């Protein structure tokens, strides 16, 4: 009558395979603040109309958890594959994350209008690699509109409808959020059990905090207030919440008065993985910078930052990101929407250091916090990740060689077809966050894709290198490198500066040191 006519799905596509486009198709084909919890109605060939909820999902590995949550809020997913490219890194990673949630995956080959397009290719891959029936695949072109209905049909027919009870205690999964200046901290939620209407007293199961709902509704696609949200629904909720960290993604929203036995599984707070110091550039100032960050941080529950200063650089901030894209985003967004101009140090992972006389192991986020006294270090550990790569046979050698150089241990190798190779390497994260994205693209003509997952901390032989410009060290220029790779980084970084420094009067001497010892030098002569 209502919840048996509901379809909760999301679009799972690798980078640039058509995810955003196809979404427009669906609304257009159905109609007559970021995009999320989009609700639309559809008249199927079978007769009645259905309530469809399109949940938006992050693409980059940086938001893997958040993607896992978005998936948790659905019954099915459309796995979008570009017929010209085929299965790529994310396509496979996302597939499995979707499988881990028992979602009905509906394959969708897009861009079949392309000359370069090759379906029997993708269908072959789908079967051999994904283990899916090539026959379930939906051929389609979003650029046009070929197969759109064919798609809405698949969703309705193949994807089961929600299955919770609206009479049981409220149980709603938070899969997204954002700060609304007028509504406050808002949470995009999927409702499994019960219902929620304005005025109700909800509670956040991880924190124990209670709030009074002020409004509920969904993107239709405009923020549309409703009288309520029932089991099986997807929408938003407002309850005068101070900020987005109070409604953490993956958290559960029940009733304060009568709560549900347990909370939806898999809650994990935000865990910054990569850090970097951000200093005020040009004429931008510490205050303006400190100000923009406080303004940004409202629309970001993942980011953390603390004041750090340098003798050379001055006053700035040590900021933690989920990964490289998140950081990139935060930068683009700051220089843009805030005008502030910032300089950013090289990124670094959090290290776990055990030093003598200190029972507790210290976590290093800022390299300058790393013990200058090597002998006082009992050991050091750094995060490792499992990197998966997809590439044409031709590029395998250079790639493998690239990986080996950066300390990657090949764990597996296979063929997604006679010309495409699949690879699994175990390498330090510290090595992936440094010129690995460009170098693999450079050597693969942009044809090789890759994804990776954190697989824990492993003890390693790392050291601290210091940078001195004319015999004068720069606290914020020091970095932690593997002892064996030290010389090379020493040299690289040396040249980077030989160029990065603007020729002034005297002679700018640059030295990279390994605990006293100098292992790299670069001196760019005087002024003219
Ligand atoms: N020729 C052709 N191009 C398409 C088709 N679908 C999408 N594109 C184009 O592919 C490019 C990227 O499409 P998007 O919809 O942005 O793909 P996306 O997954 O949203 O990209 P990201 O937002 O980075 O994840 C754009 O030029 C789209 O118009 C298609 O069916 N045929």
UniProtKB/Swiss-Prot annotation:
Its main location: membrane. GO terms for molecular function: GTP binding; GTPase activity; ribosome binding; translation elongation factor activity. The keyword Hydrolase applies. It comes from Aquifex aeolicus (strain VF5). GO terms for cellular component: plasma membrane. Belongs to the TRAFAC class translation factor GTPase superfamily. Classic translation factor GTPase family. LepA subfamily. Keywords: Cell inner membrane, Cell membrane, GTP-binding, Hydrolase, Membrane, Nucleotide-binding, Protein biosynthesis. This is Elongation factor 4.
